[PDB]
Design a protein around this ligand. Structure first.
Ligand SMILES: [Ca+2]
Lengths: 8, 119
């Protein structure tokens, strides 16, 4: 999927 | 942790890709400044502040801390076996996921210019 930073 | 938070969003908002929430308004995702742009951004502002508070606990890292939770049959629950750090972070994530499910999603507010608009 990802390692995008967050979903805050 | 963030993997668990992502699964919380998938359970409460199964219409849409968690990535939709990863870069929204001034608070959802990387951002943490300025005036929240709408109701969804306000969910994220509260979540961001919630994590800052949990960070005051010794050795508590909300981005990485694995907690115990369940999401079945429309119900999200943080479990009883959580320590103080796990319990606080789980509740920050749970309240955000519930908040996300009730607020309207404005496509215009996705991927906005943080440097220009979030002062
Ligand atoms: Ca944020």
């Amino acid at each position: 999927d990802a390692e995008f930073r967050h979903d805050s | 942790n963030l993997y668990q938070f992502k699964n919380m969003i998938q359970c409460t908002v199964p219409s849409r890709s968690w990535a939709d929430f990863a870069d929204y308004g001034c608070y959802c995702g990387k951002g943490g400044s300025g005036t929240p742009v709408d109701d969804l951004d306000r969910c994220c502002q509260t979540h961001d502040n919630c994590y800052n508070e949990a960070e005051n606990i010794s050795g508590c890292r909300p981005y990485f801390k694995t907690y115990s939770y369940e999401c079945t049959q429309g119900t999200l629950t943080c479990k009883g076996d959580n320590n103080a750090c796990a319990a606080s972070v789980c509740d920050c994530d749970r309240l955000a996921a519930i908040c996300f499910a009730g607020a309207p999603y404005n496509d215009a507010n996705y991927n906005i210019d943080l440097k220009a608009r979030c002062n």
